[PDB]
Amino acid sequence: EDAELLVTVRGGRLRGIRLKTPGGPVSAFLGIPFAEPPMGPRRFLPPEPKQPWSGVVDATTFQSVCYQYVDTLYPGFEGTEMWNPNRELSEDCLYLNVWTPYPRPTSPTPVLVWIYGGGFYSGASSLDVYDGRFLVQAERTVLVSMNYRVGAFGFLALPGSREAPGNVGLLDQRLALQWVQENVAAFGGDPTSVTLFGESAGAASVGMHLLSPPSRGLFHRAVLQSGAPNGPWATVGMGEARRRATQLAHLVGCPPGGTGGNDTELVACLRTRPAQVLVNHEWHVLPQESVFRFSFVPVVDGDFLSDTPEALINAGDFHGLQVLVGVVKDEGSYFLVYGAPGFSKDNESLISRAEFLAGVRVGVPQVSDLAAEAVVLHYTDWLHPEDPARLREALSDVVGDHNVVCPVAQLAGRLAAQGARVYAYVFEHRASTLSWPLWMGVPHGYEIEFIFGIPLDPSRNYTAEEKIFAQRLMRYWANFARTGDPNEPRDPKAPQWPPYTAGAQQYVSLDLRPLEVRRGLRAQACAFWNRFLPKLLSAT
Amino acid sequence: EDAELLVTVRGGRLRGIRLKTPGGPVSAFLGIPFAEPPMGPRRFLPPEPKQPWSGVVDATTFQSVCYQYVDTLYPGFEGTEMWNPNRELSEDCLYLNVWTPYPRPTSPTPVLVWIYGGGFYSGASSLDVYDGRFLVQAERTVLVSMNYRVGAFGFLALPGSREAPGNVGLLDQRLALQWVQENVAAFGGDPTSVTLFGESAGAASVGMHLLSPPSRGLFHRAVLQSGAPNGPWATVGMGEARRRATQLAHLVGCPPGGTGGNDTELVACLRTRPAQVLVNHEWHVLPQESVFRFSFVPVVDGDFLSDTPEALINAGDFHGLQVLVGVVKDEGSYFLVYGAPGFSKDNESLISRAEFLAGVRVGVPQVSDLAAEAVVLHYTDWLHPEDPARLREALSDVVGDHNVVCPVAQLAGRLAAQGARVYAYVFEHRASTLSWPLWMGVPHGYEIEFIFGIPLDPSRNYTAEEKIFAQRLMRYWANFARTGDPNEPRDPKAPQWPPYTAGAQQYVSLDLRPLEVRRGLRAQACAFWNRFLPKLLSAT
């Protein structure tokens, strides 16, 4: 009887499961409860710690996925299904997972904590692509990941109200971080060495925890993959959050005709609706046809965030912090088939100039005509203004730069200039197994499978070079979690990864070739997004 | 084994299964192949008869559903999922079903042949709501139902070409009718007394078989429930069919740029695509925003239909034919939550005037502004031009009259005036169990469960009166199948159902109350759609 699969934590006892990898076993504790189930009167409220239990909680399998929209744009297609729920939906979903090496470490060990993305409306810690076994086996760190509420359940906000304050999904994540502080030692993990990493909305979440004092004490380093809290999609204002919550209420019959609509009556009516009914009307509250925009996201209300992420990033002192940040080569391409005219995943998407110009308004919603003209100016090649392949790549750059690359470059420079040690990458390898079309390149999200070492899975069909590549990346991430520095403390031979500075703006390319040092994260394009375009809006 | 579960037909031997009902058993032969699988090079081609087979084909369960779009507007909702595929999808789907009384009839028995609807893009003979057991037990009829190809697989058409001539789904249905002629006697059925019945696109199908000489000899009576072949959604012109097939081809990368163009190359490239890839782009070829319009429907090309259904209906000689036709009380309401602004199944859908005016353009697509104005004039109550509930009901009337009621009334009068004996009904009972909101009333499709006797299913929660009502309706349908006359052959007690005539236009209400005779199928509204609005379009 393997005793390493039995563990006690502050709330009670647990039984885990042994997971195999080609390099040897790992111990996993899947489905640990960290909150009271946020159901009934608790819908929309901050999470409450899980009261202790008697007996042995089974932690041999993932728990339920939090209620969420399910992507049906392409039934049966691996490229989208890999992100969809792979356990039943439930509002009873606040559970977390721990992978720990075997044998259990005897000395405290650095902890990696994964926060999944999914635009704040989807995602689950149980997805096959977030399987922590290969990372824990290869680098002998401890890995934690949590579920947190998404969509209306995590982020519906009637600002000011007690009944739906907003941001409860971010509090779910915080509660889990408090849980790691109090219990990760029982797994051999070092609560004084906790590195958050996250992708897309999970990166925005990691960043929001940097900027929230109650969370900032629960971790020591940060990794932000393809996302940032200052993204145009990552936060929303009090007025717009209240409008979205109120329209959601209207769409599900709340409040009943002739009844008052103050915040208490509205949330109470919302709390009587079946969860799926809320899910089914979520996309219908966005103010305009768009891509890369999500209905229920963190709200800037003075509580979890005392000011906007932009204000807090500018004023912040980040001495003592190490950050790893990065982007994939083609951040925008994946979003174009969700609404840009002329795009299809099943053809070459060779759009016309008219389609490009309409696409700019979908990819940059809610901006004046003069602003759109400025976008078209910067992104047209005026020697080939109607070449469809260039227009396709250009709209991909518009969406990616506006939503990911330039918010990230912005954050990276302000952090580096104000005290933090920053490392930056661009991920340029396209999986040999990628099922999206070739024209999308390296889409948003397709470095994750390499960070988690999925190529080592013997049941998959990756190449031998991709396995070596994956091991390289896991070493980088674990080095950063251990020491604050992705460079090997022992290999002065291997090419080095220099820090990112607001001046030299150096970053490395991650692909099958050895590291290559480059300068500037699309500096010219991001000067347009970050410096000029705002001034353009002020003078309307 | 029971002897009567074993049957031989022209192609080989079958084993059926015994189905229970509260009144006694029935013998069912589910999943009989009637065509060669229309796969590979046979995709888009007319069906070929199923070659005979060795041994016993198992006919104990339903076979596969033809590839089709799956409704995701409301995940988990009974009201939509009752229509979704309940067997796996396959291009190998040309199977039919035979229910027969136990014990097997010894003298030839009248045959009812069900053709399902689903807008020509969806549907299956296996759906629970088409369970033929209660009709066959209660009325000792033989019941047949077939699968036929839908969507692009049944109705993509490059007119003229041999590679994709169109209407092959209608040819599937005909092959099944030829099969009933050659084999139904083996089940105790009388091939000289075959009554086709069908709902929505199945009723349009039944109507198309009336107007096609090769089909017309395969049957003797017709029931058209909530649909007609002259409906604005039920057929499409050669040019528009070619445009839709070509855009579908484009959306899936056919032809590979820039090689290709002619119909042979286009269809060959389409035949190499996974079926699901075609399904995934089906809705993106419709010319504009609309409700009650479908991409791939029967094409008027001079072959299956030598002329438009309207022309053939007007010229036709229908002596010797008996027809039953009818509509539900609220033909339009279902469709409004699929596109009309302001509508939602989860609220009261109390639309504003603005929404109603925009809805008219969605419900009456591709008409001039002046035509839309005429629709608004006819459908506004000018004493209450802004009352939300009246506007909600008015747009429902707009969609239902235009798409169903007035095409049916038109067909009914031309048939009766030109030699057919016609009976007409309006179905006015709203199921006690109906899951759609109360404001939708008696939606499109919700008489089917009463015609098939589903209230007798003891695992369901219908009322005692709905069971009696169901039995009364099954009597009418079977009486009409046996004698051509829904009226009880001798019973003078029960109130009488008088024929529909182009002069008196009498019809009956079907609900829990005894029959009531009424005159005029929305005569004033249908005069607007059938007589005036065409003249308004002629002078643009």
Ligand SMILES: NC(=O)c1cc[n+](CCCn2ccnc2/C=N/O)cc1
């Ligand atoms: N209008 C719809 O029915 C609808 C369908 C799918 N979606 C999924 C949105 C996916 N998406 C768009 C931009 N970015 C994303 C996902 N990022 O993870 C949204 C709305």
Ligand SMILES: NC(=O)c1cc[n+](CCCn2ccnc2/C=N/O)cc1
């Ligand atoms: N791909 C899409 O977003 C989509 C668009 C329209 N539809 C139409 C749904 C079905 N429908 C609309 C009008 N009438 C019907 C069904 N009639 O049976 C489905 C999917």
